[PDB]
Amino acid sequence: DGKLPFVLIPYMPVKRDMYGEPDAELLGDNQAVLGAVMRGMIDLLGRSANGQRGMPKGMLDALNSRRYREGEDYEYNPTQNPAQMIIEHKFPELPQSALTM
Amino acid sequence: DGKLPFVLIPYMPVKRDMYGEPDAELLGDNQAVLGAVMRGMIDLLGRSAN
Amino acid sequence: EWNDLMRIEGKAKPPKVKGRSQVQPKLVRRQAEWRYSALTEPFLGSNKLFK
């Protein structure tokens, strides 16, 4: 052949240059932005309380409170409705902006 | 044959390397995140009075 | 730097903060995966490689 035995193959050729550009050149910012959104969604769910029960004080007497905790029928003071009480924390709803972004 | 009798077959080949990468390499984080959500749903229902 | 974006090893690595998630989706890797099979397949579609 009489010349160098090496062959150059660029992916995206550069004007009057040897080395081409890979796809990672254009997606540097997009990957970083996408990573921030995903971590934010996990932190919102992960750090949030889940499965914990909150009971207002004075709604149940000493004996009735134990029976409720043991899974039996109980009686409550009518001044406080357990429907709005007995908070059962769950995962907060994900904002629509995070999905849109 | 005059050479080693072993044959190497990679799943996802690595650039200039023998051992390939299985699918478990890319799904390490996804499985852990999915497991956390499933356990949270069960805990909410299981611990709730019914 | 380009190799540090294909895999999360270099500057693209998220900071390690206690009590917060450290995951990072592989946007660059996903694009490359759909390109490997697309380009390798035509060369391996026949027993003869050179005509």
Curated annotation (Swiss-Prot), chain C:
Domain of life the protein comes from: Viruses
Subunit relationships: Homododecamer.
Compartment annotation: Virion
Taxonomic source organism: Enterobacteria phage N4 (Bacteriophage N4)
Name this polypeptide is given: Probable portal protein
Function according to Swiss-Prot or TrEMBL: Forms the portal vertex of the capsid. This portal plays critical roles in head assembly, genome packaging, neck/tail attachment, and genome ejection. The portal protein multimerizes as a single ring-shaped homododecamer arranged around a central channel.
UniProt feature coiled coil, ranges: none
